[PDB]
Ligand SMILES: COc1cc(-c2cncc(-c3ccc(C4CCN(C)CC4)cc3)c2C)cc(OC)c1OC
């Protein structure tokens with residue numbers, strides 16, 4: 607049989623230290639191709655090792671197609687091939703788009719759904735998985751209004767990489783180095799912190815009574831761009847600051863409920879934070 611492997615790379619949709627992401631075409635179908643830099647090879651290996659352990663398949667997890675290693679003259683080329691989401695990342699989408707109640711809830715409940723799927727151990731099934739780099743750039747928007755979680759290059763697996771998380775989204779126990787590193791639940795609680803920040807980013811863009819906030823990243827008012835580890839530790843650990851809840855949210859029942867939820871993702875005590883499954887249930891009862 608013919609094994610068609612050619613992918614036509616059509617346009618670069620992302621560049622960073624990790625390498626590049628391309629929109630590509632295979633057999634007439636759009637695919638996303640992440641080409642890894644040499645500096646971030648361990649992210650390709652970790653995501654590949656995870657998918658070789660468990661073939662995750664969930665509507666709110668970016669769909670895996672392939673991991674490719676190709677020998678070159680002097681180097682190894684590493685590609686991750688996934689489904690392609692033409693609307694781009696949530697970070698991208700929120701810059702330019704405002705939301706109503708239904709679209710805001712649909713976005714955040716779809717993220718919580720993907721996260722709870724990662725976190726849960728299923729017997730027979732999947733290991734429990736923590737993401738460790740959840741943020742709005744690692745969430746893609748689908749045409750049906752739901753999102754999917756991307757980038758399992760830092761993921762950790764549990765059954766009963768010199769890359770670190772994005773500093774802006776790091777939980778207090780990561781910044782003050784008290785995280786209980788031998789304890790899998792620790793990693794879930796770091797994801798919940800980051801989820802609460804994403805929930806704040808999205809809620810700001812929900813219109814109520816003709817008002818909306820501009821897109822800002824978490825802690826935009828208290829740290830520089832590309833904040834240092836120390837910048838973050840002073841804000842989050844020493845001063846114990848949290849993102850602002852605008853007064854206008856308290857006129858809207860949805861944003862009032864979302865403010866309470868994001869508060870219960872941001873407790874200093876990691877074991878006080880809500881679980882992804884409890885966040886889902888709360889979101890199903892809003893509106
Ligand atoms: C190697 O590399 C790539 C391969 C492909 C690809 C292309 N055509 C057909 C296939 C295929 C799938 C599955 C079987 C099965 C059939 C059932 N039988 C009982 C066992 C074997 C055979 C063939 C694949 C996997 C795409 C790629 O990119 C999109 C590849 O590059 C990453």
Ligand SMILES: COc1cc(-c2cncc(-c3ccc(C4CCN(C)CC4)cc3)c2C)cc(OC)c1OC
Nearest residue numbers: 608609610632633635636637670671672687688689
């Ligand atoms: C990697 O990705 C894609 C792959 C393919 C593709 C190409 N040839 C063959 C297959 C296939 C056939 C048959 C089985 C068997 C498995 C066991 N049993 C005997 C029943 C069924 C498995 C696999 C596939 C899945 C198509 C794709 O898109 C349409 C892919 O997505 C980009």
Ligand SMILES: COc1cc(-c2cncc(-c3ccc(C4CCN(C)CC4)cc3)c2C)cc(OC)c1OC
Nearest residue numbers: 619627638639640688690691694695698744756757
């Ligand atoms: C986060 O992580 C991964 C993401 C993806 C991925 C999948 N669909 C669509 C995209 C995308 C398309 C288009 C834009 C637009 C944004 C506005 N403007 C700047 C032009 C371009 C942005 C994003 C991406 C980036 C693939 C991945 O691997 C193959 C990822 O890594 C796991």
